[PDB]
Amino acid sequence: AGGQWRLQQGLAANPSGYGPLTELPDWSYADGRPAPPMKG
């Protein structure tokens, strides 16, 4: 759903493509230390 609308906004057709939802880190250490980059 919403693939064509997302393309109209310049986003990836799939929400799992490029953008903060996928590329940003999933987690970080509770003290604030950044996690290692994810494999994907």
Partner: protein
């Protein structure tokens, strides 16, 4: 998640339904408009770079 919300968070799900209904109405108004008018408040899309 939406199915889980419908069962365990009915108030939150009604809000999501209200939000979807509002956005649907904004789409209807825009379709009638020629584009001269401004876009709906909820229609506005946040951009990322």
């Amino acid at each position: 998640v939406l199915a889980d919300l419908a069962i365990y968070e009915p108030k939150t799900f009604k809000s999501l339904a209200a939000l979807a209904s509002r956005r649907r109405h904004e789409g209807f108004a825009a379709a009638l408009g020629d584009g001269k008018e401004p876009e709906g408040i909820f229609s506005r899309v946040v951009q990322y770079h």
